[PDB]
């Protein structure tokens, strides 16, 4: 499959 | 030119996504708000008024509080905004506020293209990622029986000759997978294959 990037987003 | 919303809705159902599917939308898709369940959508970069431009897939895994964003081209948010005038910050805000206790979510997205630069199969690769998403929502981007069939290559290499044969093979395997699991695809195959062609943008 595809390589991926995981980012944390707080609101 | 490409895939219509009716076409994609029928394929998504054929792939076993139906119970979790939120439908097809333009850039004003609200997000995952209804409840903290396994969910997905197919979203266009443009508003309905333009007629549509590019297809994207969004998944929500409640177990990890992850929003998966699949662009067949694996562009970055900055690059989706430059090229397609598309941003989905408000969507991630409405979702994290309505579904997560800590007001935080994890945003997981591809860094690699599976699609050729001239191809019109974006809607179709999106159906395929959603098949991988609904069966393996913990590991959907790679390492599962559906996404293992495709070869992701770095996004920065998208308009290079060395990767064209890898991306063409990916398009051939996209059709083989779909013909295998989707009666809608089988019945409309000649019209779909022609309209989503690997070299379709060069033949408008
Ligand atoms: C992919 N690489 C090629 N591009 C496309 O397949 C894009 N196709 C579309 O947008 C279709 N449009 C519609 O189905 C109408 C529509 C537009 C918007 Cl913004 C949202 C929704 Cl839900 C539907 C195609 C027929 O042009």
3-class DSSP string for chain B: CCCCHHHHHHHHHHCCCCCCEEEEECCCCCCCCCCCCCEEEEEECCCHHHCCCCEEEEEEECCCCEEEEECCCCCCHHHHHHHHCCCCHHHHHHHHHHHCCCCEEEEEEECEECCCCCCCCHHHHHHHHHHHHHHCCCCCCCCCCCHHHCCCEEHHHCCCCCCHHHHHHHHHHHHHHHHHHCHHHHHHHHHHHHHCCCCHHHHC
Three-state DSSP at A6 gives: strand
Is B122 a known active-site residue? yes
Domains and CATH numbers, chain B: 1-204 (3.40.395.10)
CA distance B19 to chain A (A): 25
What is the experimental resolution, given in Å to one decimal place? 2.1
Count other C-beta atoms under 10 Å from residue B159's C-beta.
11
Residue nearest to atom 14 of ligand 1 (CA): B4
Is B71 among the residues known to form the active site?
A: yes
Locate B90 and state its tokens.
């408000």
Determine whether B59 is exposed, middle or buried from the number of CB atoms within 10 Å of its CB (0-12, 13-18, 19+): buried
Residues paired with A6 in a beta bridge: B108
8 A C-beta contact, residue B195 and residue B2? yes
Residue pair B7/B124 in contact (Cβ under 8 Å)? The answer is no
**Interchain CB contact of B106 with A (< 8 Å):** yes
B204 burial type by CB count under 10 A (0-12 exposed, 13-18 middle, 19+ buried):
exposed
- B172 contacts: CB under 8 Å, gap ≥ 6: none
């Amino acid at each position: 499959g595809v390589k991926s990037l995981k980012r944390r987003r707080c609101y | 030119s490409g895939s219509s919303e009716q076409e994609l809705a029928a394929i998504v159902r054929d792939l076993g996504c139906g119970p979790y599917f939120l439908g097809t939308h333009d850039k004003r898709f609200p997000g995952f708000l209804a409840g903290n369940k396994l969910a997905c959508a197919i979203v266009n970069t443009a508003g309905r008024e333009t007629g549509g431009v590019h297809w994207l897939a969004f998944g929500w895994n409640p177990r990890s509080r992850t929003c998966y964003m699949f662009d067949p081209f694996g562009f970055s948010d900055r690059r989706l905004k430059q090229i397609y005038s598309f941003e989905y910050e408000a969507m991630l805000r409405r979702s994290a506020l309505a579904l997560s206790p800590d007001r935080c979510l994890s945003l997981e997205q591809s860094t690699q293209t599976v699609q050729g630069p001239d191809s019109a199969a974006c809607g179709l690769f999106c159906c395929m990622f959603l098949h991988a998403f609904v069966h393996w929502p913990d590991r959907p981007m790679d390492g599962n029986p559906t996404m293992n069939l495709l070869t992701g290559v770095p996004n920065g290499m998208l308009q290079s000759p060395q990767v064209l044969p890898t991306l063409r093979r990916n398009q051939e395997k996209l059709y083989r997978f779909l013909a295998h699991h989707s009666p809608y695809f089988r019945s409309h195959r000649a019209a779909i294959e022609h309209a989503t062609a690997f070299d379709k943008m060069k033949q408008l």
